[PDB]
mmCIF file of C-alpha atoms in Angstrom:
data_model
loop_
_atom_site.group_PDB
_atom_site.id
_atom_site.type_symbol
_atom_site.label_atom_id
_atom_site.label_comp_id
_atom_site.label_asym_id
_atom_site.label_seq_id
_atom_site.Cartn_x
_atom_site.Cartn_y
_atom_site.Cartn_z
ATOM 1 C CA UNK X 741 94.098 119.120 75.882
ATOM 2 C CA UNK X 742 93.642 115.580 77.192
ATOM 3 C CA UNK X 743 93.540 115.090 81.122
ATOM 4 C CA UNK X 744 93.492 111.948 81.172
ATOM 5 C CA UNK X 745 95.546 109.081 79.066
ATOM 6 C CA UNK X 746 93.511 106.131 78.208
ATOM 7 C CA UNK X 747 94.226 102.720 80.330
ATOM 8 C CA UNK X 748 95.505 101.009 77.418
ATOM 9 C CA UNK X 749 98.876 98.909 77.135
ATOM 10 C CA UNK X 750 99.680 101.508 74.161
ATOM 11 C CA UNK X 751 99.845 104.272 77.046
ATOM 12 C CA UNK X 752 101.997 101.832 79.587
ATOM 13 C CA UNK X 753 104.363 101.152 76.838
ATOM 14 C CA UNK X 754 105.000 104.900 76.268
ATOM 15 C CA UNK X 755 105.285 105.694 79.885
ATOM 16 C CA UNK X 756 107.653 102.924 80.037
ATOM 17 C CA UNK X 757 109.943 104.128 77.222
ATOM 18 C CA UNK X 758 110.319 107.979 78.208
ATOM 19 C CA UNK X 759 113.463 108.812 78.645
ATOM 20 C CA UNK X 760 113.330 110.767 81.672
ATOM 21 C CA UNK X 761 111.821 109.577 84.728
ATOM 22 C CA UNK X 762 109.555 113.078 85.552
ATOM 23 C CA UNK X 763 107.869 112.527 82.619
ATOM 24 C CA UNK X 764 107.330 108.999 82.725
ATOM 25 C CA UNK X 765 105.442 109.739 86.434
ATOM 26 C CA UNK X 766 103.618 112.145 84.924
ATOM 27 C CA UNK X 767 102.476 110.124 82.624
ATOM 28 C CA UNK X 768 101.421 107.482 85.065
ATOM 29 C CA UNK X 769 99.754 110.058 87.066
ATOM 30 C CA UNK X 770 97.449 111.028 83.989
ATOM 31 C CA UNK X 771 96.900 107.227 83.460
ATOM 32 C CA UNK X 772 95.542 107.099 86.652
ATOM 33 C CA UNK X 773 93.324 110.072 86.148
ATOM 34 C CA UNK X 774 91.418 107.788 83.681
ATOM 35 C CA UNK X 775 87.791 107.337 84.813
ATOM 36 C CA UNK X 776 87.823 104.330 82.748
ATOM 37 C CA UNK X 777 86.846 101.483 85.392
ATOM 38 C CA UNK X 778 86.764 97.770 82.997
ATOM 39 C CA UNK X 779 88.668 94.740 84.386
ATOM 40 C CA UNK X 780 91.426 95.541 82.029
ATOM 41 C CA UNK X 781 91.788 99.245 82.945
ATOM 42 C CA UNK X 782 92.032 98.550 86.695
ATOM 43 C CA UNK X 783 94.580 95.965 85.651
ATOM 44 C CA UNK X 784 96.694 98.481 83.538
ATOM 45 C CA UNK X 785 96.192 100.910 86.636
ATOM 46 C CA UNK X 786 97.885 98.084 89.033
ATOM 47 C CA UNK X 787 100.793 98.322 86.559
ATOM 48 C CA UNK X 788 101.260 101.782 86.137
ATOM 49 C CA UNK X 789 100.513 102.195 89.939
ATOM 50 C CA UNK X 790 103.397 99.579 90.904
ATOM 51 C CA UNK X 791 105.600 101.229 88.398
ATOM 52 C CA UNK X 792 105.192 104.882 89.537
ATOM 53 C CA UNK X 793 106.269 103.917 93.019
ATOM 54 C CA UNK X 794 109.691 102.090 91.553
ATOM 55 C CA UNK X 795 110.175 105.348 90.009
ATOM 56 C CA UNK X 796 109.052 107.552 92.905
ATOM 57 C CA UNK X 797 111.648 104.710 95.220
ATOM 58 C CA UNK X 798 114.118 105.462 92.793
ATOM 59 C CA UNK X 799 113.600 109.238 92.825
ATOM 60 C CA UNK X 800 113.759 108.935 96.750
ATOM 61 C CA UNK X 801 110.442 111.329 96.899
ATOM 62 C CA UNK X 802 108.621 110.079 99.987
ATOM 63 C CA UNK X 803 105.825 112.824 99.823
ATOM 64 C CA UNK X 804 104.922 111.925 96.161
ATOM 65 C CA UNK X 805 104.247 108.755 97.762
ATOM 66 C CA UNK X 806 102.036 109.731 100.382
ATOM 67 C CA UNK X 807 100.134 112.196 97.896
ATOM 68 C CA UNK X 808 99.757 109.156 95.991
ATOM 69 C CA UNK X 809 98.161 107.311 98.361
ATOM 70 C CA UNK X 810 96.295 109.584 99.420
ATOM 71 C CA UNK X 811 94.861 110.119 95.889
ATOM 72 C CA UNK X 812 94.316 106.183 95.602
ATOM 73 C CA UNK X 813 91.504 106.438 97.985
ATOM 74 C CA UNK X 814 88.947 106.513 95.700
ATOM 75 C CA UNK X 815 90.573 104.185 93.585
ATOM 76 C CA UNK X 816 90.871 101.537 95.965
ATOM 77 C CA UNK X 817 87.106 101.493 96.079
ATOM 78 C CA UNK X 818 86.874 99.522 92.515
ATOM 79 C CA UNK X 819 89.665 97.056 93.776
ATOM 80 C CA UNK X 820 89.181 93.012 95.311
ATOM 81 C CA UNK X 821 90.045 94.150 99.243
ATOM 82 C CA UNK X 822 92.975 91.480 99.362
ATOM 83 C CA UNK X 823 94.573 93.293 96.359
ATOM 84 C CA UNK X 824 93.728 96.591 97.671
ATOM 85 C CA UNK X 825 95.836 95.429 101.026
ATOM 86 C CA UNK X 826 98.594 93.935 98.589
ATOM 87 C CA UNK X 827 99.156 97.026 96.908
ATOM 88 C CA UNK X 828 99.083 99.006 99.933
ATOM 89 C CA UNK X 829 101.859 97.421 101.505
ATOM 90 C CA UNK X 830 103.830 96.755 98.434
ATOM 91 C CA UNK X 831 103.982 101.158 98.902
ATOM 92 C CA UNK X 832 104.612 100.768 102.522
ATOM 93 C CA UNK X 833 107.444 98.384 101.926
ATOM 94 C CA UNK X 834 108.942 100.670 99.348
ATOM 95 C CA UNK X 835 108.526 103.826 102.054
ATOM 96 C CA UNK X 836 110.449 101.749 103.935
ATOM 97 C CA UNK X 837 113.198 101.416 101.602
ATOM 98 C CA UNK X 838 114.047 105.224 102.386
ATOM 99 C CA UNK X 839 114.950 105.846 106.301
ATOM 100 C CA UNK X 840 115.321 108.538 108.498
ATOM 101 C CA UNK X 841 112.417 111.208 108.773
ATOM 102 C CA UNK X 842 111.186 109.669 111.940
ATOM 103 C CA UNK X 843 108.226 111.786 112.222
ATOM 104 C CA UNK X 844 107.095 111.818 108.774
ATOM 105 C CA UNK X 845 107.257 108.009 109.007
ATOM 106 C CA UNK X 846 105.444 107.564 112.349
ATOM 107 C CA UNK X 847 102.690 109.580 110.698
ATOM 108 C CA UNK X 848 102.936 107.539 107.111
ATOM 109 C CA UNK X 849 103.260 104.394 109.586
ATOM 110 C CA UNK X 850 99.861 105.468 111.433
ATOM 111 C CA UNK X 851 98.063 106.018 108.258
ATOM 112 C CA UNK X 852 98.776 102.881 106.481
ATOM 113 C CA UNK X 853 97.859 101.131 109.603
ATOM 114 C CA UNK X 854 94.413 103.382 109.691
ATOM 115 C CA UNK X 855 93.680 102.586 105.919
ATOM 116 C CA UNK X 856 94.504 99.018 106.416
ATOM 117 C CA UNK X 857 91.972 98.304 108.944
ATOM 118 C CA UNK X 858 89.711 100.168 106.592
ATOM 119 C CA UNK X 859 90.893 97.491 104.002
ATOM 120 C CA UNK X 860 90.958 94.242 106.567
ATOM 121 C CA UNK X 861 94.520 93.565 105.399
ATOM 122 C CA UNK X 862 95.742 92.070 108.748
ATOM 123 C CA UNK X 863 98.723 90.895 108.350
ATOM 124 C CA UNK X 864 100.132 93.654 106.649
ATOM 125 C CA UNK X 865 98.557 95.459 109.488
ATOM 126 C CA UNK X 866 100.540 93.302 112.189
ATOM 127 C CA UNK X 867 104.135 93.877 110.253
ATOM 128 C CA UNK X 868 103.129 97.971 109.602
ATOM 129 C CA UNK X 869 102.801 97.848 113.585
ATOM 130 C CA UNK X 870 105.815 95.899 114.012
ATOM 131 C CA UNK X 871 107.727 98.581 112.356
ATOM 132 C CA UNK X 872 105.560 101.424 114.283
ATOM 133 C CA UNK X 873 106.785 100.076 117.447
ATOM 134 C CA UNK X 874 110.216 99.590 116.009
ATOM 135 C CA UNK X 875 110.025 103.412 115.307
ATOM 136 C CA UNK X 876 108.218 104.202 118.572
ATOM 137 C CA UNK X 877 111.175 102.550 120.236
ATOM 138 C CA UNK X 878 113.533 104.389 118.321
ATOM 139 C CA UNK X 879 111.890 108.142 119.573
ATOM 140 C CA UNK X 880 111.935 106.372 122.993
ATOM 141 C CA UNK X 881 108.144 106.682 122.932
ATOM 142 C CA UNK X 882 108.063 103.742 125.437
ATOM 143 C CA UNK X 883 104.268 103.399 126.778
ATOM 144 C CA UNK X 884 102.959 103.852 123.226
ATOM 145 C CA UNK X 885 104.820 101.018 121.716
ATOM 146 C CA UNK X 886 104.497 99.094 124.655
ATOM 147 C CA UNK X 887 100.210 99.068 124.439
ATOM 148 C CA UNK X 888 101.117 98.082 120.372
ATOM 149 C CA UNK X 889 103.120 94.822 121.303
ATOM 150 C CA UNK X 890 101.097 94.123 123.889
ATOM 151 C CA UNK X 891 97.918 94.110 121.689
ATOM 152 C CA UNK X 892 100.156 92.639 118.217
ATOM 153 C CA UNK X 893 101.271 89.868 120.665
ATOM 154 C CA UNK X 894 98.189 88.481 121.635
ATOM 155 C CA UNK X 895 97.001 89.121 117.941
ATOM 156 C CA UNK X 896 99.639 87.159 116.269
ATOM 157 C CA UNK X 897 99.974 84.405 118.551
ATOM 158 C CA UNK X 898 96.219 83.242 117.309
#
């Protein structure tokens, strides 16, 4: 059968009205599968991209969110960088809306700030470090988050 759903606003109204919120991920996640790469695709994609991690917030699955960005590496590729950064923090930010897991958010914390120099998204980059060092202070990892604020400091006061 199909693999991937066409990146029409046919198959975003559909995902939209499933009635259970598994399916209407998976049908995001096929959405996103599309190859299709027009103007109005990667627009659709944004969509279905921002509404997949509401759901994925609401279903409080963390790891679906890091496979997810993980698997929009290749999509960010076809993306202006600015909205490439925007949508990268809007899923940061939403991480962030689920606590504890210190670890697991150190490491999601490191990433994000490793793909957004990759993306030049600095001041998303400056607030993701702010809330590394936040963390880092929290583990009582002092000389790590010291080096962080020392460097963010000078960074941000320019």
């Amino acid at each position: 059968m199909a693999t991937f759903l066409p990146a029409t606003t046919d198959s975003l109204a559909q995902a939209l009205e499933a009635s259970s919120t598994a399916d209407s991920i998976l049908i995001l996640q096929r959405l996103l599968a599309d190859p299709s790469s027009s103007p109005d695709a990667l627009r659709i994609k944004e969509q279905a991209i921002t509404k997949l991690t509401d759901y994925l917030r609401q279903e409080n699955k963390a790891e679906d969110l890091r496979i997810l960005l993980t698997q929009l590496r290749s999509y960010f590729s076809l993306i202006p960088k600015a909205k490439t950064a925007k949508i990268v923090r809007v899923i940061i930010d939403t991480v962030a809306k689920i606590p504890n897991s210190t670890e697991l958010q150190i490491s999601l914390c490191k990433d994000m700030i490793q793909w957004t120099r990759d993306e030049k998204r600095t001041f998303l980059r400056q607030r993701v470090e702010a809330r590394l060092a936040a963390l880092l202070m929290e583990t009582k990892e002092f000389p790590e988050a010291l080096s962080l604020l020392s460097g963010l400091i000078k960074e941000v006061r320019r």
